[PDB]
Structure 1
Amino acid sequence: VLSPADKTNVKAAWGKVGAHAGEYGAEALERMFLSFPTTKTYFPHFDLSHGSAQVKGHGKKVADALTNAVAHVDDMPNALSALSDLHAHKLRVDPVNFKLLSHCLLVTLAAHLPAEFTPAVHASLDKFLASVSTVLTSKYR
């Protein structure tokens, strides 16, 4: 579960992301396609070229779903309801894959938040990405 401090810590790092979310989000996805190339099996109908509009848009959608979760940290299931349904019933993405993106996102924040990515901010972020992943996977079966 997320402790009080965890929430303060996400809300702080994320605030800092500010307007770049969409950009960060696109960077994460490309980090993932390069690192874990099996994750591409889920995007066969995307142009996964670098700078592709497809990747940049989806990047922005991802980041928006994250800001929202950040906004409704005390109520994620609710806040992501529509999203867990989609991933569960439509995309049917194997739960392993959520670890992979979370990792890639964490690397993305690291590279862009020198001053803020303290060991404790890092732990709280790792946890929140775990919870986001658990909420999104919860209706799979």
Structure 2
Amino acid sequence: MLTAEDKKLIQQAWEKAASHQEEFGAEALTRMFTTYPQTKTYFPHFDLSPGSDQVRGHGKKVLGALGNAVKNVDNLSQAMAELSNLHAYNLRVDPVNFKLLSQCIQVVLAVHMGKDYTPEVHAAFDKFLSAVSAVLAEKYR
């Protein structure tokens, strides 16, 4: 599945996100809900207000998962197991949406890393996110 040098890049990129999980996670979800309104449909129980304790709380859980994805970037399937089961089976999240969250996470990184979000880092992170997205819709049945 993943490459090598890319593993170093995404690890760099991560070290930046790792210290702002709650904010980055919250901003990511807020951007998704704002840009792709249709996604709100999956959170009818949430208060989708930008400063929502819920959004922030979720955002923190999302980025936490990604962090653990980074740590086990070499056996993704066995780590995200519980999450693919939840998203695929329990939630029935349309796979198209994983692309939407992925772009929003990247926008958050570009906004905060500016020039440091280089074509190389962008490319490595884009692979990582697509890989993670694949394992989440791997139980698709």
Give the structure-2-normalised TM-score. Answer: 0.96
RMSD over equivalenced CA pairs, Å: 0.9
Give the structure-1-normalised TM-score. Answer: 0.96
Which structure 1 residue ranges, 5 or more long, are not aligned? none
Aligned residue type for 1:127: K
Q: In the alignment, which residue of structure 2 is the partner of 1:67?
A: 67
User: Does residue 1:109 correspond to 2:120, yes or no?
Assistant: no
Q: In the alignment, which residue of structure 2 is the partner of 1:48?
A: 48
Give runs of ≥4 in structure 1 deviating > 6 Å: none
Residue 42 of structure 1 deviates from its aligned partner by 0.8
Spell out the pairing of 1:5-44 with structure 2 (5 A cutoff): 5-44=5-44
CA distance in 2 between partners of 1:126 and 1:86 (Å):
23
CA distance in 1 between partners of 2:113 and 2:19 (Å):
14
Aligned residue type for 2:122: H
Q: Percent identity?
A: 60
Residue 62 of structure 1 deviates from its aligned partner by 0.1
Q: In the alignment, which residue of structure 2 is the partner of 1:121?
A: 121
CA distance in 2 between partners of 1:116 and 1:21 (Å):
19
Q: In the alignment, which residue of structure 2 is the partner of 1:80?
A: 80
Which structure 2 residue ranges, 5 or more long, are not aligned? none
Aligned residue type for 2:95: P
Aligned residue type for 2:82: A
Residue 115 of structure 1 deviates from its aligned partner by 4.4
CA distance in 1 between partners of 2:123 and 2:20 (Å):
22
CA distance in 2 between partners of 1:90 and 1:21 (Å):
25
CA distance in 2 between partners of 1:65 and 1:18 (Å):
11
